Every structure is written in structure tokens, then in C-alpha cells.
Amino acid sequence: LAKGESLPPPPENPMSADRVRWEHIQRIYEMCDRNVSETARRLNMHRRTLQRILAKRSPR
Structure with missing residues (x-):
């Protein structure tokens, strides 16, 4: 029923909301x-946030 926000849109766009973040992290x-610390602060997030983002893509 309905469209727009009533039916979740996939990461159709290259510049996804989180995609842009990961790019900034790098x-x-x-x-x-x-x-x-600089990364998370420059990403506007908690140190754990940056860490978890790194830690899910590495055995670290």
C-alpha cells in the first residue's frame, strides 16, 4: 500500500546515506x-561507531 516512504527504497543511489559516511571514514x-578518534570526530560519531565500522570489515 502507498509508495514513497511507505515502501522501503533499496540503496539504488550511488551516494547512499551510510555509503557517504564510509567514504568519509576512509x-x-x-x-x-x-x-x-580523529576519524570518528570528523565523521561526527562516537569512537565506538568508527571502531565497529572498521571492525565489521576487518578481524580487528
Whole structure:
């Protein structure tokens, strides 16, 4: 029933909401040389947030 927000849209767009975030995590993670604190702060998130994002894509 209905459309728009009544029927969940897939990640159809290249610039997904979280996709943009992960991209920002990388550009900072590179420049701060793996400083998770700078990354999370530059991503506007908690250190755990940045960590979990890294930790789900690595055995770390």
C-alpha cells in the first residue's frame, strides 16, 4: 500500500546515506594515519561507531 516512504527504497543511489559516511571514514582514516578518534570526530560519531565500522570489515 502507498509508495514513497511507505515502501522501503533499496540503496539504488550511488551516494547512499551510510555509503557517504564510509567514504568519509576512509579519507580521514588515511590522513590521520589510522587515528580512529580523529576519524570518528570528523565523521561526527562516537569512537565506538568508527571502531565497529572498521571492525565489521576487518578481524580487528
